[PDB]
Amino acid sequence: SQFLKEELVVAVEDVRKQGDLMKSAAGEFADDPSSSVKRGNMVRAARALLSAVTRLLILADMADVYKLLVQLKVVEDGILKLRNAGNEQDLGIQYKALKPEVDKLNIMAAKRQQELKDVGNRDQMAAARGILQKNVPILYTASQACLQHPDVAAYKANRDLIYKQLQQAVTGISNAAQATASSGGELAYALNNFDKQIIVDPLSFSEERFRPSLEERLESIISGAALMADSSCTRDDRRERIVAECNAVRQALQDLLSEYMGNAGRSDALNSAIDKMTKKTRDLRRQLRKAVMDHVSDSFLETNVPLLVLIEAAKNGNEKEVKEYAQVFREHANKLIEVANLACSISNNEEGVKLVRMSASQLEALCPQVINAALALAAKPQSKLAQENMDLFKEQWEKQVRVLTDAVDDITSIDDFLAVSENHILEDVNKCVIALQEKDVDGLDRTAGAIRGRAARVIHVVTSEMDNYEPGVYTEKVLEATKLLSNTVMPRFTEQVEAAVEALSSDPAQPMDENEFIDASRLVYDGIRDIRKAVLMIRTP
Amino acid sequence: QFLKEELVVAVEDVRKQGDLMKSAAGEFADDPSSSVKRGNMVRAARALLSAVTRLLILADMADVYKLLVQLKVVEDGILKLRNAGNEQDLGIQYKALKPEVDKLNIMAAKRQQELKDVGNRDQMAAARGILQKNVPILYTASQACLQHPDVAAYKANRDLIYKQLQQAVTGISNAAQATASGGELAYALNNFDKQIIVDPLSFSEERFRPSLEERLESIISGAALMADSSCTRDDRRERIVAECNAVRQALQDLLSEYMGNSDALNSAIDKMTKKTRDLRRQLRKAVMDHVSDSFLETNVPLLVLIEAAKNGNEKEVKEYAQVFREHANKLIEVANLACSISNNEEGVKLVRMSASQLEALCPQVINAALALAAKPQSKLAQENMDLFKEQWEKQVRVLTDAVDDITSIDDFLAVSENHILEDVNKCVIALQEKDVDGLDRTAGAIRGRAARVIHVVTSEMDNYEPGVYTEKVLEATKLLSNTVMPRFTEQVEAAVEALSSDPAQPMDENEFIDASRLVYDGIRDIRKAVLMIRTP
């Protein structure tokens, strides 16, 4: 940092000389507000002084990058040392001297991130700083669990996983800072392309052998749409409708194909075909929206349930049940990630797609860590620190699930969720009244749980999409309907269901009032519908 | 000019900030090792930079407004120059215009070199060049519309020039205004080659497919413009399509290889760079293809139109105007194509400026033919056609030598040698088949391409300074011109004489083939001589 200092003093002397020149020229113009020459000399000095100041400030930029490289190498060595800890005394010291350098690095890297220009590097820098700050205090506890219970290898796997993520964050900072030289969804991009790429006459030899076949674009679009509609998370309803829409958007293209193949005239018969094609593409767009809303309303319930089953089986020292429920938990996490990926696919917003994919990837990286933490707790169940690790990883899991949930909420339309959840909760209150009408205790319990979960989901979604607007009268009425369904309708419905289940599962079968139960169910539905209409007022399209 | 108030505001601001920065820099240099004083120096430097950049953008906006007012002045003065009724009033409006038009041209040059864009730069350059070259032409068009008020051709020409100047001033307005954002296709091609790789480990399959696929498709469109062109050989565009499919396959292969991560995937990247370089070479070969194949006959439709308009035919001169327009468009195509792939930025600017100038000049010669066919006896028709043909041939050779200086000479020599070998075999086989039109056309083509070679090597050997390398190739070119073309034109005309007559005598076919192999070997020899610069 010495050559930089000398050349920076050089540049600052340059800048002071230019400032003297600029002051002289400006004082000379200040006398003649009319001389087009004094004005010319003023601007000619301004440009050169601006160039000199720019030289100096880019020297300062290079100096800050120089400092950040060695700070990053310092924290790299510190991470390597905190990993290679011997006992809880050397480890407890490596942390009391790494946090200062970690914080200095984080601040300098935020500075350099604000100094960047390319936004991909901005986000790489932000994610690297975030992973750094999240994993250093977690690498501490992982190394502590390694050194206290060295008999379990799951702790070693977690220590090494967090160390690898930390080194990846180090290298990400390095490249996002050093490299100073120089966005919608996948299905939405191709859908808008195919919407616009059907306006040219392809009988010519200029866009039938160079540009892609207007059939191949549709075929890859169908590949994506049937990838979504074949997901294990898709209902049969959306699947049938997506099949219908794919076969109706291939018929509107074959109609358009036989319209452009026989025209080749610079025509009107093909305007009907292009309008039909536009409308069929818009309809398949809407159907993919309906399918992803199906996914959001369905799979985003019982969010932290496999985790709870896993930790409850791991609190009891079990080993094979832990592996079974851990494979199940990995599967459910991958189900969440697949749903988030489909919703990222059909989405147009550039920022939301990035947040969704990044949060889902972080949750995917967290999945094996909490699996190993549950395994290591079950391996040493009568341990304090294993219990603490399990608690920490369960809280991390709940937080990551909540942030992925909010990302998918904000990346999608509010009233679409309102309507799909309204119809689903109607189907479910019907399932509930039916399970009661035949005294099906299991069906009644399951359906009431589904109804309550969907209600709480809708309340969280409505309160999340209600903060995007200013505190006003519309928000007042909407949040009033929300808290009314909150503190009234759902507790009443729950008490009704509990009374019915108690009346069924008793030594004397008690004839509960079947009338008020149905009233609480229809109250759930009508509250959902009321809130839906309340949110559906401040917009006209 | 009412903004000078904010100017003095920003001047006082910049003075205060510069004094503050000089004080802070003195504090730093007096204590060269202080994290606080250095920080304050940098803070003051950034504040001073913000102040002087505010001042700079204020000055640029003042520049822009004064240019807008000058442009409105020139526009209204041109409106006066067109509607002038007297030659006295036309002279007075031109007297009041010429300095104001020069002022507008200088200001437009300033705001062109100060444009934050690279394309609107060229647009306004061409527009103000049109305004620079056509106002003195509107003067004479109006003088000849006020001196022959009967011939509607003179009025059509005057008003065509007026509409062109109005397009020029509106273009200057639109270009210098909206600064809101090498060559057309070469830029995207080199940036494709820049974006082929980024980061192996943090590589997402759904974050780079848009960039790479869309870049590939834009490149494919830019190359299809050149391959599927009015003047580009069939085999050439088939070769281009082959290389386009190859580069598409290579892009998809590079995508499927970046799906696996950074070891064995280097081969896919090398194949990608190979395919993009080979497509670059095929496009350059296509440009060189329609250079020798289109620049050999420059004044043909002009000459035929001039003769058929001097004779006064109406239908003939109209068909010749259409062939003249087809020729001008066929040449503008080659201009834009050779521009879109060259990295010589200033050369591209010059070529495109000359190309738009000639594009505007074409309908002027059209209306000159209009004036000649309608009044062939009239005194002013001769001078009108003479001026416009002079300007036309001037701009033709200007665009020729302008594209010559963005086109590598060695590729020109290669494509010219292969093309004249092709035409010489055509000529031989037409002499053995005894085709009078065949020999006529083939000898014309060979002689024209040889003259093309002569002109390009003459215009290229002046960029060097006379030495052994200079004279060694100058001798070959002089030998070609003053030896083989005589001995070839002589043989082919002896053929068309003895064959297209009664005796049908064998026109000494061995000497004919001797002259043909002579012209091939002479072009090849000039090539071999001038190619003694470097090997890598």
Residue numbers in the entry:
A (entry chain B): 83 to 264, 274 to 357, 361 to 635
B (entry chain A): 84 to 264, 275 to 354, 361 to 635
Sentences copied from the publication:
In epithelial tissues, the cadherin intracellular domain binds to β-catenin, which in turn associates with the F-actin-binding protein αE-catenin. Specifically, αE-catenin functions as a force-sensitive structural switch that displays two-state catch bond behavior: it transitions from weak to strong actin-binding states between low (<2 pN) and moderate (8 pN) forces. The structure of αE-catenin comprises a series of α-helical bundles organized into three main regions: an N-terminal (N) domain that consists of two four-helix bundles (NI and NII) that both binds β-catenin and mediates homodimerization; a middle (M) domain consisting of three four-helix bundles (MI, MII, and MIII) that harbor binding sites for vinculin and other protein partners; and a C-terminal, five-helix bundle termed the actin-binding domain (ABD)18,26. The interactions of αE-catenin are allosterically modulated by binding to its protein partners and by mechanical load.
Therefore, we determined the crystal structure of the αE-catenin 82–883 dimer at 4.0 Å resolution without dehydration, and also examined its structure in solution by SAXS. The ABDs in αE-catenin 82–883 crystals were disordered, and the protein is extended in solution, demonstrating that the disorder of the ABDs and the extended nature of the molecule are not due to the absence of the first 81 residues. Superposition of the individual protomers in each αE-catenin dimer crystal structure shows that although the N- and M- domains have similar structures, they assume two different orientations with respect to each other due to differences in the N-M interface formed by the NII and MII bundles. Cysteine labeling provided evidence for this coupling: upon binding to E-cadherin•β-catenin to NI, C228 in NII becomes significantly more exposed in αE-catenin. C228 packs against Y237, which is directly in the interface with MII, so changes in its exposure may arise from changes in the NII-MII interface. Murine αE-catenin has 12 cysteine residues, which the crystal structures reveal have variable levels of solvent exposure. Mass spectrometry revealed variable levels of mBBr incorporation at the different sites that correlated only weakly with Cys side chain exposure observed in crystal structures. This may reflect dynamics of the molecule in solution vs. the conformation observed in crystal structures. Notably, Cys 324 and Cys 337 in MI, which have limited solvent accessibility in crystal structures, label strongly; this region is also proteolytically sensitive, indicating that MI is relatively unstable and flexible.
